[PDB]
Design an enzyme around this catalytic site. Structure first.
Site, short mmCIF file in Angstrom:
data_model
loop_
_atom_site.label_atom_id
_atom_site.label_comp_id
_atom_site.label_asym_id
_atom_site.label_seq_id
_atom_site.Cartn_x
_atom_site.Cartn_y
_atom_site.Cartn_z
N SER A 132 0.72 -1.29 -0.10
CA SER A 132 -0.22 0.03 0.11
C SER A 132 1.01 1.37 0.06
O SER A 132 1.77 1.40 -0.88
CB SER A 132 -1.02 -0.01 1.25
N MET A 133 0.98 2.02 0.99
CA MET A 133 1.85 3.29 0.91
C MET A 133 3.27 2.59 1.27
O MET A 133 3.94 3.39 0.79
CB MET A 133 1.36 4.18 2.41
N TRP A 157 -0.06 2.16 -3.32
CA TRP A 157 -0.65 3.38 -3.26
C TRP A 157 0.23 4.54 -3.77
O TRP A 157 1.30 4.37 -2.99
CB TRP A 157 -1.50 3.48 -1.96
N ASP A 178 -9.26 -4.23 -5.98
CA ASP A 178 -8.75 -3.39 -4.83
C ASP A 178 -9.53 -2.09 -4.85
O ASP A 178 -9.88 -1.52 -5.99
CB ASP A 178 -7.15 -2.77 -5.07
N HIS A 209 -7.60 -5.46 -1.27
CA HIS A 209 -6.55 -4.74 -0.90
C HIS A 209 -5.23 -5.21 -0.20
O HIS A 209 -4.14 -5.17 -0.26
CB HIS A 209 -6.91 -3.14 -0.63
#
Ligand code: CA
Length: 262
Positions: A132-133, A157, A178, A209
């Protein structure tokens, strides 16, 4: 640098198993420098020095979401650090800085005669992963540090999708359904932006996700691919070329792409 082959010859079954060939032990970092906390996973019996990988979680998440990668990768011959960030709300650029600080601490512990990993790390061979991040941060790390040997962002992300500068071999895991980092505005445009590297895109069919996180239902396939990619590119080990480059021919994969893979 030549090759850095460790362990027995790989097979599909040996890469799909949850436990690789090497016994793993771990320790928590007593005084983390530049990041929130870390668990270090290392092989006790790898037969030579091994490369190091730093893994970062997503926004609001902790090491539990990425823990499974620690033993999964270390058991094939890597020193792996899974980190917590200074704050679980840190953004991707900060996550990249903390990821690189964790790799630097692995290099320092390799110099430390009191550490379990004293002399176990080849600090010239490093890789980055994250969710993700943290996957966004892994792409930032790769763009800013082309000496890295491999990168594997998972459901990344990112505010910006342009990673055209990246020369590091990059495997992007994506999750078909996602809704937090939708493939069409994150993972796929990121993947398409990279024209200067070996790269691969593996989209998990039906995946939310969290499809590459601890407890996911595809650890055999995802783990096989992650290990194969890291072995091929961090160890220059062409015994892993086919596993790293192949379409897995898996009903579990909704979209597969790869470029410049050998
Ligand atoms: Ca589908």
């Amino acid at each position: 640098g030549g090759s850095h082959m460790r362990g027995p010859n790989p097979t599909a079954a040996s890469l799909e198993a949850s436990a690789g060939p090497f016994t793993v032990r771990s320790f928590t970092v007593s005084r983390p420098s530049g990041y929130g906390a870390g668990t270090v996973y290392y092989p006790t019996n790898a037969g030579g020095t091994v490369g190091a990988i730093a893994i970062v979680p997503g926004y609001t998440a902790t090491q539990s979401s990425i823990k499974w990668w620690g033993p999964r990768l270390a058991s094939h011959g890597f020193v792996v650090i899974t980190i917590d960030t200074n704050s679980t709300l840190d953004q991707p650029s900060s996550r990249s800085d903390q990821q690189m600080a964790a790799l630097d601490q692995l290099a320092s512990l390799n110099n430390d005669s009191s550490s379990p990993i004293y002399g176990k790390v080849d600090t010239s061979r490093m890789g980055v992963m994250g969710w993700s991040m943290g996957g966004g941060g892994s792409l930032i790390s790769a763009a800013n540090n082309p000496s890295l040997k491999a990168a594997a962002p998972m459901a990344p992300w990112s505010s910006s999708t342009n990673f055209s500068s990246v020369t590091v071999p990059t495997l992007i895991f994506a999750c078909e359904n996602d809704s937090i980092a939708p493939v069409n505005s994150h993972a796929l445009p990121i993947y398409n932006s990279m024209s200067r590297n070996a790269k691969q895109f593996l989209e998990i069919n039906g995946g939310s996700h969290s499809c590459a996180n601890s407890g996911n239902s595809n650890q055999a396939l995802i783990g096989k691919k992650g290990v194969a990619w890291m072995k091929r590119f961090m160890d220059n080990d062409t015994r892993y070329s086919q596993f790293a480059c192949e379409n897995p021919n898996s009903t579990a994969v909704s979209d597969f792409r790869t470029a410049n893979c050998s």
